[PDB]
Structure formats: structure tokens, C-alpha cells
Design a protein around this ligand. Structure first.
Ligand SMILES: C[C@@]1(CO)OP(=O)(O)OP(=O)(O)OC[C@H]1O
Ligand SMILES: C[C@@]1(CO)OP(=O)(O)OP(=O)(O)OC[C@H]1O
Ligand code: SF4
Ligand code: SF4
Ligand SMILES: [Cl-]
Ligand SMILES: [Cl-]
Ligand SMILES: [Cl-]
Ligand SMILES: [Cl-]
Ligand SMILES: [K+]
Ligand SMILES: [K+]
Lengths: 405, 405
């Protein structure tokens, strides 16, 4: 905001993807697809966490047979989340053999590096595109440098070698990835697949490379782009790498749906990737999913236990109130609340939030000004400052986000 | 890498900051500075975690008296980490009254919005600059939009109003922040402070604004820049916002030292901010601090418990081996290890790492190829695949990062 790269709109089920539409969050299950109970449950969990589209692997016949049942069960729950089928090597076979699965999916993902080789590859690709066209389904053509077509790389390495100034092998691999996606995009369009039925991706695992790749894809094609840093890994590394890779592109207006490719720790839920995706988009002002807290790090000017506990309590309370607030108070997802440690940046940061509190740091009288809408609202003192503040936030929301219209 | 914005070199103690030098990680204590034992311990903890420079608040007389003792104790431990003193409102008084503190610090931080007002402000600023010059200390002039000089904003709001096409109030606040830093920079230089003694910052709490601000600062000044998203907040939000704000600038070559402004949860250590800072710089290929793991998210094609546990074990083992490895094997900090869930992207991603393993996913024979230096090394099978792989990684490191020269 802004400006978005303009693109045609591609509907993935009821969710529109493209330049005129909010950037969508999506995620992918990790249960065996043949396990209908486990996969249905996880799709629900991911959707409830904020995944607007959910992808599942459709890797073998047993998975393919399961898809119509999963979709049936989701619909029985009144949940219309679009499902993307992830196909590799035998997608043409499964789509051919299981038309009920083909119809149940809301989008097909093809990888131009896992279609086979030679004219087998061309025919496999054409069959899947033909099936999509016949059913009116959209397709993501998704290249990944982990599965890059070796024949194409060879072609480009030779082209490069003849150049007056040849590029490194690494630059050529990135070129080939882009070329793999662009050639398949152009082929699909030439076969009759609509511009309203084509999404592209070309993922790599390092941020700097990803920025290069998606700038090229954005320039060379008109399609909405599925953006993600592939194989981002574990823990803080996976979170940081993902945000670092996506933000430069998103700030330039590139990307129409995102997925965060975290490796879960055994103890953490699959939904973490959805939480990260939401935070990336909200950090950049591109979506508003829920209220957020701006808080200083705290330093020697404030008492650490009190301040850290206050900031945590405020974050926890906003999370708890949200289901009620969403129902009563349109627009509350945009709420910004500040919790600040001392007079140095307290009042100023608080006056930039919708409502904020500045605690007394060292050398200050034990009172805590509260600011709302850019000016002083009141001053709190004594015990229970946390609870008094949260009541003020509650009152603030009731008034600022009152419905009607 | 690249290209860095060129800047003169500013030494903060023994650490050089500037375009010719690696981007430094720093952090700030949150213990009361007057508490010598607590603050000395935390500086050590932050330095041991990777903080190359450490800042502490010097907020009152009791803090000021403590600084020489903290520095003495650090030196007794053989630890030469540079200390930055953070001054607000009374910095001129503390530096005047406690020359031993002024000498003990390796850098002074001034905030042009916490100097006072009117010609008092000018004189306070001049006194601190004069003290730095006399002691040969460098200075960070650090503006923060949480403490923006109201007189300057008023000046610019009037300038804006007279324009043919006035900007929003928000754009003007950002303009004023930049102007506050630039005017103080130019004043300091005019007083005789060397270009080798001046670092600048101008922090705001939203990523998109920060990118704007630092692009302006980079254009209008020649100083090395201390880059950070101020008041980033808690949890995943704080991590993501910080990475999203910094990466666009770092990829453009802007920024010579960084600090990540996380609010700690009560149960998490202050060192988390250092871990995040390291991951941002390493994600962008600007520093190498330690080996890292590239791993897929896992999906229905692989068994989740086995794969997630393997990837975790590998990450844990690299962390455990690092102290030994650093001593024996120069350059090992650059090691990239892949752990992949199935044949779709396993081999290709693994061939982009120094060494990687591709597990058997569904429909594959129960064996696991290992790749090193871009080609197949061997194939593992049976129980104990994790341990066999880690021995191969150990052997790989011994050979690829052998010393000598
Ligand atoms: C499932 C895979 C298969 O190509 O999907 P992509 O969209 O290429 O990338 P990502 O979302 O990182 O998931 C892992 C990949 O293996
Ligand atoms: C300590 C403060 C004081 O201005 O320092 P800055 O460098 O402005 O910003 P940050 O590093 O986010 O720390 C919090 C600020 O209050
Ligand atoms: S606002 Fe005050 S307490 Fe918070 S980090 Fe800044 S100086 Fe320290
Ligand atoms: S590499 Fe295989 S197991 Fe890992 S996410 Fe990709 S398809 Fe799934
Ligand atoms: Cl997805
Ligand atoms: Cl999981
Ligand atoms: Cl710092
Ligand atoms: Cl802490
Ligand atoms: K898990
Ligand atoms: K803590």
C-alpha cells in the first residue's frame, strides 16, 4: 500500500488472488493425505489459524481417493476453504484416473521440474492443463530450484558460455529457474488456459536470490505470483529468513499470496507458519488480522519484571478479547496499542498508537500517563494499573470502532 | 555483498563500523546500571551470545558512578567489549561531573530530542560534543520518533503548509525526524568532531517508515548508520517486524551496525535479540556466525515425527560441535547443511548445500542419499541414519575447512 503490481484476478475457490485483492495467506498440511481424519482435522486447524487457502500433497492413488472425502467433510462443517492439490511425477495419471479428486480440488499445483523428461514432459504438462481447462480450475505453475529441469539448465549453461561476458554458474541456475516458469506460463496460455486461471512461483532457499528471481518473474509475466522462501528451516532462522526474503518484494508491490516454509520443531504446531505469514503482512501494513502491541525493549530505566509482565498481559488480553471484539466492533483488527517503559520514548510512541501507556521509569514519580488518539487521556497510579489500562482500552475500542453506518 | 554504501570508518573501541567493515551486531542491557554485579553479568552474557558492542543506560548519578567499575570488571575477565553510554536529558551534567565515566565509555549516545529546549538544547549538545572531542570518543546521534523535538516538527509543519502540494502530517513527522538527525550531524561536524567519530540513527516503529527514513539519511549524510526498528514488540511479531524492516535496507547496502529492539517475555533471555540480529545478517549473506540448516517444511510425502526430529537433531549437533570446530577448522561458520523430506526437492536442495541428506518419502525405497559438494556421496539405510549422517558431516568439515595455508 502501495503500489501493487497489477494482475488479473484468479479465483481459488471463493478467494480472489491478484493485484486488486488483499494478499492471501496460505499453508500446506503435513499429515498423510490418505488419512482422512488427520488431514481433515489439520486443514480445519490451519484455516481456523488464518490460512485462507490450504494445500495438500496428492502423491499417490490412496491420497487421490481421499481428497473427495476430505472436501465432503469440510463442507459438512460449513467450511469453504479452498484446497490446492500438490502434484509431482504422476499428476497426469492421478487427475486422469480420479476425476472426482480433480473436481474436488479448487486448484492444481504443477511443477515443471517434476513432469518427467523429453516429450513425455510436454505431454504430461498438456494433459494436466487440459484437465484444468475442462473443469474450469486454476493452476499454479510452481518451479523450485530443488527440482530444476536438468535439460533446461544445460541449455542455458551453453547459451551463457557463448556470451562475450558469461555469468557465474549460480546466476545461470537462477536464470534457468525463471525460464522454467516463464516457458510453462507461455505454453499454458497458448493452450487456452485463461489469464484468470494461472498463478506462478519460482522458489529458492536464500533471500537475496529470491528477490532477484521474483523481480524477473514480475517483469516477464503478467500472472499473480505465489511468493515464498522455500526450505526456510527451523526456529528463529526460519522465521527471520522468511521475513527478510519477502519484505523487499512486498514493499515493491510484488506478490499476491504467500506461504511460509518453516520446518516445525517436534513440539510446535503446524499453524506456526500461518502466524508468521500473518505477522509479515501486517508488519508491512498490507493486511490487518488482529490488534497489535508496540512496546519498547525496556532498559535500565525501567523495572524489568513489571514492564515485561505488563506488556505480556496486554498482548494476552487483546488476544482473548478479539473474538468478541470482531463481532461487535468493525475494523478493530487495526488497533495499535503501546506499552512503554519510561518517559524517554513513552509519551511520543504512545501518541502514535491508538491508545498507549507510558510507565514510570527511574527518577520519575510513580504514575503512568495514558494517551489516546494522540493526546493525554488520563494518568493512572497505584496497584492494578494493568487492569485499569485494559478497561480504558476496552472503552476506547467500544467508541472508536462502534458499528454504523 | 553488495554493494555497501561507502562510509568513513568509526572505531567503537576496537570494533570498526563503516562501509569497509562487517556489519556489527549490538544490543543493550536492561539491568539497573547502578547494579554493578547484575550489569557486568549481563554485558558478559550479551557479549558471549554475539553482541560485538553493548549499550547501557547512564541515566542518573548512581549509574554514572557504576560505569568505571563495570568496565574494570570486564577488563579483569579479559573481555574488551566496547560500551556505549545511553544519555537522555542530563547527559551533559553526568559527563561533566563524572569524567571517569566519560573515559570508561567507548562511545556516547546523544538524542537530539532529549537535550532540553531552546538555546539550552544547543549548549547541552555542544558540551557533550566538546567532551567527546577532548577524550577522542565517538558519538552516535540517535533520533527516535518517540522523542522528536516539538519545535522542529512545528517548523516543518509550517513549511509544509505553505507548499503548493502539502504532504500528510505523517510524512512531515518522518521529514522532521530525518531533519533532526541531519542538522545535529552537520552541527557536530562544524564543531570539529571528526567524520571518524560520528554515527547516526533515526528510528521509527513501522517497517515501511523506517525504510523511507534510512534511505533519506543515507542520501543526505556520509556517516555510518546504526539501523534498527525501534519498539518492535513481543514474540513472533517483534522478530518478523525487525527482519522485515531491516532487510530491504541491508539489501540496498544501507546500515553499518544493527540492534534488534525486542520486548523480552518474562521467561526468555535478553540474549534473544542478539540471536535475531545474527540471523538477519546471515539470512542476507552479510555475515557468517555459525553453521546453518536448510530443511523443507515436510508434507504428507514424508513421516513427520522422524523428519522433524532428524532436522532438530542435526541443528542441535552443529550447535554443540561449533566451539570445537571454530578452533580447529577456519571458515566453518559458512557451513550449510541440508535435511530434506523426500525425493521431490531433496537431491536438488542437498546439492546446493555443502552436505545434505534426502530422506525417503512415501513410495520410495527406505534409503537416504547423502550429497556433498554438489554430488552424490553415499546412500544410508537402516537405523541410526541420523548418527551416520552426523559422522559424515564431521568428516566433511575436517576436510573442507582444514587449516593451512
Ligand atoms: C511442497 C513443495 C514441493 O515443490 O512446494 P513448493 O511450493 O515448491 O515450495 P514450499 O512451499 O517451500 O514447499 C516445499 C516444496 O517441496
Ligand atoms: C533506548 C532507546 C532510547 O531512545 O534507544 P534507541 O536507540 O532510540 O531505540 P531502541 O534501540 O529501540 O531502544 C529504545 C529507545 O527507547
Ligand atoms: S522507552 Fe525508556 S525504558 Fe523503554 S527502552 Fe527506551 S529508554 Fe529504556
Ligand atoms: S521436499 Fe518432499 S517432504 Fe519436503 S515439503 Fe517438499 S514435497 Fe514435502
Ligand atoms: Cl501453500
Ligand atoms: Cl507438525
Ligand atoms: Cl544497542
Ligand atoms: Cl530480560
Ligand atoms: K510438530
Ligand atoms: K525475560
Amino acid at each position: 500500500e502501495g503500489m501493487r503490481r497489477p494482475t488479473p484476478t484468479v479465483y481459488v475457490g471463493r478467494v480472489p488472488i491478484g493485484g486488486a485483492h488483499p494478499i492471501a495467506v496460505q499453508s500446506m498440511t503435513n499429515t498423510p493425505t490418505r488419512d482422512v481424519e488427520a488431514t481433515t482435522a489439520q486443514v480445519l486447524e490451519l484455516h481456523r489459524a488464518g490460512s485462507e487457502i490450504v494445500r495438500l500433497t496428492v502423491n499417490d492413488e490412496e491420497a487421490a481417493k481421499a481428497v473427495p472425502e476430505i472436501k465432503r467433510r469440510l463442507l459438512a462443517e460449513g467450511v469453504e476453504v479452498p484446497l490446492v492439490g500438490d502434484f509431482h511425477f504422476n499428476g497426469h495419471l492421478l487427475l486422469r484416473k480420479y476425476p472426482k479428486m480433480a473436481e474436488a480440488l479448487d486448484k492444481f499445483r504443477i511443477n515443471p521440474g517434476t513432469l518427467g523428461r523429453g516429450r513425455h514432459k510436454d505431454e504430461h504438462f498438456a494433459e494436466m492443463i487440459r484437465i484444468a481447462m475442462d473443469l474450469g480450475k486454476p493452476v499454479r505453475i510452481g518451479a523450485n530450484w530443488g527440482s530444476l529441469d536438468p535439460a533446461l539448465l544445460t541449455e542455458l549453461m551453453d547459451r551463457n558460455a557463448s556470451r562475450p561476458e558469461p555469468k557465474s554458474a549460480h546466476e545461470v541456475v537462477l536464470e534457468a529457474l525463471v525460464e522454467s516458469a516463464v516457458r510453462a506460463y507461455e505454453a499454458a496460455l497458448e493452450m487456452g488456459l485463461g489469464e484468470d486461471k494461472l498463478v506462478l512461483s519460482a522458489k529458492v532457499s536464500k533471500a537475496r536470490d529470491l528477490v532477484w528471481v521474483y523481480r524477473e518473474l514480475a517483469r516477464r509475466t503478467q500472472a499473480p505470483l505465489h511468493l515464498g522462501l522455500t526450505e526456510a528451516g527451523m526456529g528463529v532462522k526460519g522465521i527471520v529468513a522468511s521475513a527478510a526474503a519477502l519484505a523487499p518484494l512486498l514493499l515493491e508491490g510484488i506478490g499476491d499470496t504467500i506461504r511460509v516454509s518453516l520446518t516445525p520443531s517436534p513440539k510446535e504446531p503446524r499453524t506456526k507458519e500461518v502466524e508468521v505469514a500473518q505477522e509479515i503482512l501486517q508488519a508491512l501494513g498490507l493486511r490487518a488480522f488482529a490488534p497489535e502491541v508496540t512496546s519498547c525493549p525496556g532498559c535500565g530505566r525501567t523495572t524489568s519484571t513489571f514492564f515485561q509482565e505488563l506488556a505480556e498481559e496486554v498482548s494476552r488480553r487483546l488476544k482473548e478479547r478479539l473474538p468478541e471484539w470482531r463481532a461487535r466492533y468493525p475494523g478493530v483488527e487495526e488497533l495499535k496499542v503501546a506499552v512503554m517503559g519510561c518517559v524517554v520514548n513513552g509519551p511520543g510512541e504512545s501518541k502514535h498508537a491508538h491508545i498507549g501507556i507510558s510507565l514510570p521509569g527511574a527518577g520519575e514519580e510513580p504514575k503512568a500517563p495514558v494517551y489516546a488518539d494522540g493526546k493525554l487521556l488520563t494518568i493512572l497510579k497505584g496497584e492494578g494499573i494493568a487492569e485499569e489500562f485494559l478497561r480504558l482500552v476496552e472503552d476506547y475500542v467500544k467508541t472508536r470502532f462502534a458499528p454504523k453506518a
